[PDB]
Symmetry: C6
Subunit: 166 residues, 6 copies
């Protein structure tokens, strides 16, 4: 079968808080764009065309909906205003781990800076936040652990028609 | 829950009138765009890529509907024609203050110049005014006080079927 | 209340005809665009950013529907073909004058050249004329007088079912 | 009342056929664009801005539908392939002449070269021919004579239900 | 009456096969674009503007639907991969020949190279092939002969309700 | 008959795995773009225009839908991150082979690098993967063999209303 887009999520945390705080998940996800590209030029000589390949250039973006009572966005704003490194995780919820690493998910690890921070409030729409990152180097592949509270959704349960007595 | 866009408003006042006049709210708000960005360039050396970050560049805008009998817009036009500094406030109506600063809202403070002032009257639409600012330095985060008259809306009340006797 | 777009009109007259002819209103108005802007560049030094502002640049335009039996458009075309100065007024019909200037309206005064003159006739649409101006200097604010004939519209009156006897 | 776009037509003839052939009208007109513009630059000095106005630049275009059995288009093609001058007339059918020049129409006279000649045949649409001219100098205003056959349309007349006997 | 676009077709053949093969018509035609243009620049001198005209630049294109079992497209691909000259004909089916050249059509003759060859297969649409040519010199006007099989369409005929007995 | 777009498929395999692994078909195909072009410039001399043609430039692309449990995409990503050559085949399912090459299909063979690798997950759409290649030299024409499992589709078969007894 096909793989849905819902199963891919993102995590963040600041570099200097690696000892005090663990990873934290954004409140509301909408979408994100992860795309890498390379530059290919051709040099012509009398023996034939030769191709030299350039360095990897990353294009990263994220979109979310601002929640009320949220403190984490202020952390990202302060990290942008002070040029601090941000850790990014991209985790898949469909591919689980085998043998030695059961109950682990397939993930990639990046470190980069924040380069853009914009939001436009309208008169009839909810706030949307766009963040664009600049990544230092090639991302690495590995397996990561996702907690139970960060993977499951919350919905109401069945209740009877009897009083809710104090 | 989510945060609506109606909870964000703007205030203006001219720098040279800081002693005589307090802050004033524009009549009709439609939307505005607040976005900050940075430019990242890569320099290549034989040891690896190095990233240098540049100064912060701001992108600010405002949109409104002109009211009849309004004097404030003339003040902005005069300030634009004479290159005077304008103070800008962005206040949230959802995040209230704690302990020492109860009944205060989370706000951000700017100072900048006016750079654009345009309006296009049609034959069947109301006048709309678009203003663009140029900000000198990084905005500061703090708590601000909003008066009761500037936060509440006005609507008609219940009336009986009796006369309005003089 | 909101200000409608129908309350803003324009007047024209050529500079060399200031003694013989008074101001005249062009026949059919559709819309116009009045927008002023400035250029803000930043110079970087070791002590901090410095802001320098340049001269004001104007963006003016007009749109109309050509009337039959109209001579005034020929005057504008001849003024364009000979580089003559054209006076432009922008008058508001909603803001009336006080005390000494009762029955006067708020207006602005410009002098500029004609730089564009285009029209495209179709097979099922009426002719539309687009004019663009190049303004010499900053417009001045003042109060202007508008005649009764140029401010009111004309509609048919009630008639009986009796003949129109010669 | 307003002026419709139908009342404006165009005429052509080649310069070297001034004595042998009179003016000829295109078969099917759809639309055309006549627009003139000027370039305005500003030079800054210590005494104030100075404006120098440039030469007039013309923008001309025509659109038509190719008719079957038409020879005139080949004349335009040969004139384009050999760089010959083409005379263009733009005549209004609503403004008639007075006293000395009764039964004459208001017209403008141009001479220019042909610079573009394109057509794109589809599988379900009729052929359309697009021509773009380049005009040598300023057009002149005058009155021109239009023949009766070139101004009136042709429609069927009433016929009885009797035979059409040879 | 008007001229439809279905009456214009194209023919091809390779230059080196002028003795062994005659002209061949492409299987399915959709549309094509034939447009010629010139560049006009103005040089200013103290006596007046002077206009100089440059060489003719051609813009040619073709669109078709690939047929199954077709060998001709491979010939065009081979000619493109080896830089061979291609002959192009554009023939009208509405203008027939007179006196000496009865049963001949009005045509135009070109010789050029192939410069583009692209096709994009989708999941629910038929294949479409787009070819662009680069023409060496001015096309020549003349009369050409079209065979009976290349001008008529094929449709089913009437059949009775009796068997198709062997 | 017309040729549908479903009859064209692609195959991949890495150059360094030519001995251990055979060709493999990627799971879900949507579309792809194969386009080749050349650059034609004209040099002017006193004897006439001369045409010079440059090297062939390729434009290749692919689009697909990511499947769950798929390992092959990781191979392409690793080949991109390490600059390895990738073999590409384009096979037609409508043109079968003759005499000595019965049950073979018409195909083309390319070798190139991976230059782009992007994917954007949404909240209500399936993942789509876009890949762009950079080809070294001109593709070669030949006949290739396609296995039975890679050419046929799979659908359910008829079942009775009796149980599925163990």
């Amino acid at each position: 079968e096909a793989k849905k887009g819902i199963d891919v999520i993102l995590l963040y945390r600041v570099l200097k808080n690696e000892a005090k705080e663990a990873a934290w998940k954004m409140a509301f996800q909408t979408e994100h764009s992860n795309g890498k590209s390379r530059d290919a030029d051709s040099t012509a000589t009398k023996d034939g065309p030769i191709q030299n390949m350039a360095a990897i250039e990353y294009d990263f973006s994220a979109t979310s909906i601002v929640a009320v009572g949220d403190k984490h966005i202020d952390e990202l704003d302060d990290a942008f205003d002070n040029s601090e490194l941000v850790e990014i995780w991209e985790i898949d919820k469909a591919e689980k781990g085998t043998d030695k690493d059961v109950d682990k998910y397939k993930a990639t690890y990046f470190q980069g800076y924040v380069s853009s921070f914009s939001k436009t409030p309208n008169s009839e729409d909810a706030l949307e936040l766009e963040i664009e990152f600049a990544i230092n180097g090639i991302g690495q592949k590995g397996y990561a652990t996702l907690t139970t509270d960060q993977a499951e959704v919350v919905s109401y349960v069945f209740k009877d028609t009897v009083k809710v007595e104090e």
